[PDB]
């Protein structure tokens, strides 16, 4: 089987593809349409990657990048060595990942489990494009996107952010921040919490959930419950990239310069402070 419980659950199901031909597991893994399709944009992925570095990129797969196209080439398809390889590598990227996603929809057909996990994954891809396609799209060229490098595309974040002054002064950014830290913390709490209900002291039994709700409610004043943390878990990370995607589509299209200023519509409003008393 490969596993104890494995066996029982291995039935020719899923197949969103056709009906087999590509319904088998190659080891622990599950080979399907999206299996070779993923291997598709992956192969050609690592196939191509290695190339733009083969040009006289350099050494240490840290400073070898693939800079996107140039900004006078604004929307067209550029040659190659001069940053066209981003177009070609990123087309396969999208295919590479989403297919990975669908690949999952299969897996969760014979187990006949939630459609959840996959759906969660997309909100994830969404960001990807808004940063690479969409933003660049509503702005001009496949140029207001990031290079593809380890220690390089970290220059895109500084330069672009700073562009605006103190991104920190961004509506959404700011938001996606709060959001990130919460769920950042939050898992550690349900995370550190469970182990504890299932592995107390060292000579004391294995407690009941009745204690989980009791234990926390008996902390801040509220304990939301099992399902809770798990729906919660969903939002928070989900939201992170949601309100996140939101600000970076507001800079350049919606906004000109100085992110702080934005916050000044509030500052110098007629009535000053708006609503003094008398």
């Amino acid at each position: 089987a490969l596993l104890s419980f494995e066996r029982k659950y291995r039935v020719p199901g899923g197949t969103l593809v056709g009906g087999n031909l590509f319904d088998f597991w190659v080891g622990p893994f599950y080979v399907g349409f999206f299996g070779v399709a993923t291997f598709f944009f992956a192969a050609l992925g690592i196939i191509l990657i290695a190339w733009s570095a083969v040009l006289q990129g350099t050494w240490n797969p840290q400073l070898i990048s693939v800079y996107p196209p140039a900004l006078e080439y604004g929307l067209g398809g550029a040659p190659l060595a001069k940053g066209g390889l981003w177009q070609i590598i990123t087309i396969c990227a999208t295919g590479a990942f989403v297919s990975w996603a669908l690949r999952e929809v299969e897996i969760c057909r014979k187990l006949g489990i939630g459609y959840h996990i996959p759906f969660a994954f997309a909100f994830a891809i969404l960001a990807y494009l808004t940063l690479v396609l969409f933003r660049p799209v509503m702005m001009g060229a496949w140029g207001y996107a990031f290079p593809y490098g380890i220690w390089t595309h970290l220059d895109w974040v500084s330069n672009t952010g700073y562009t605006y002054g103190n991104f920190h002064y961004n509506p959404a950014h700011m938001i996606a921040i709060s959001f990130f830290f919460t769920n950042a913390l939050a898992l550690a709490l349900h995370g550190a919490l469970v182990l504890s209900a299932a592995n107390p002291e060292k000579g004391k039994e294995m407690r009941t959930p009745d204690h989980e709700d009791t234990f926390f409610r008996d902390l801040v004043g509220y304990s939301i419950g099992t399902l809770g943390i798990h729906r919660l878990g969903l939002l928070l990370s989900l939201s992170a990239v949601f309100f996140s995607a939101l600000c970076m589509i507001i800079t350049g299209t919606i906004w000109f310069d100085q992110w702080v200023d934005w916050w000044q519509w509030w500052v110098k409003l007629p009535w000053w402070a708006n609503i003094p008393g008398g």
């Binding site: 597991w25 995370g191 504890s196």
Partner: protein
Amino acid sequence: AEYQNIFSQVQVRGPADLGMTEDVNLANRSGVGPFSTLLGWFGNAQLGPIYLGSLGVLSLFSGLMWFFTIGIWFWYQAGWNPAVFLRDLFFFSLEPPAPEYGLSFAAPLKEGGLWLIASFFMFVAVWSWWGRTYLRAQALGMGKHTAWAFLSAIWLWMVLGFIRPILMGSWSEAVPYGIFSHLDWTNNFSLVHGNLFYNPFHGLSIAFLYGSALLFAMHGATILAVSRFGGERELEQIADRGTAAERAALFWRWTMGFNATMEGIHRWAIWMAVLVTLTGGIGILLSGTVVDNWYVWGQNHGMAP
């Protein structure tokens, strides 16, 4: 199917539960516990019980006293009254050393002196909570993974705020009390130190952040989708494993190549969240005491774009 995950649809009520509590109910019991309608759709309903313990109050004496010293401290640069206080708010802050100085309690109670005080009680407040998430745990049965967990969090606050800005000298450093400038800080903190982007700790910390992001999302998911066989009440499945525990197990196995247990996941969790701020403190305890410029390091070894 579904919709028994998010939305809920139905709602059951009645009596209210409450566990042992080795150490008294005196304080406990508390307030009525007025259920919440549309609160019970997304989560439970019951608001309360709630403790009102020993260490639980000082965090308030303190915590409160603190909040104030600030709001009272963003007076001098206010003139007073609502319009003003309602104009900025986000702008106000309570600025640390100025003539700089060092680790001297500085120039009087004035300058930077007040930072001094408010900051001191946040020490008290926050430390009094640990007493609670910690000792409060011995009364219900449960263990202190929690408390410990919350200890890495005290590290970051500790360092950047108290521990960190001293191994150097000058109190000048350290995070001011605000909403807008306390932002500013972070920004000119990296900026002084080349770029906190070449700092290995902050970076792995960012590495870790997304990892808790990756992992919480996924977790809530692999459980909301198995919740059909009650993939939740994990603690029970930790005891005697159900097909739900597996079904989930099996999914990422035939996808990534490896599966855990309805118990390791939460383990990978605590762990992820923790290593978070953890490295970020190590990375702070070291920024300014061993490196004034980080870019150098990178191109002083081999890494940089």
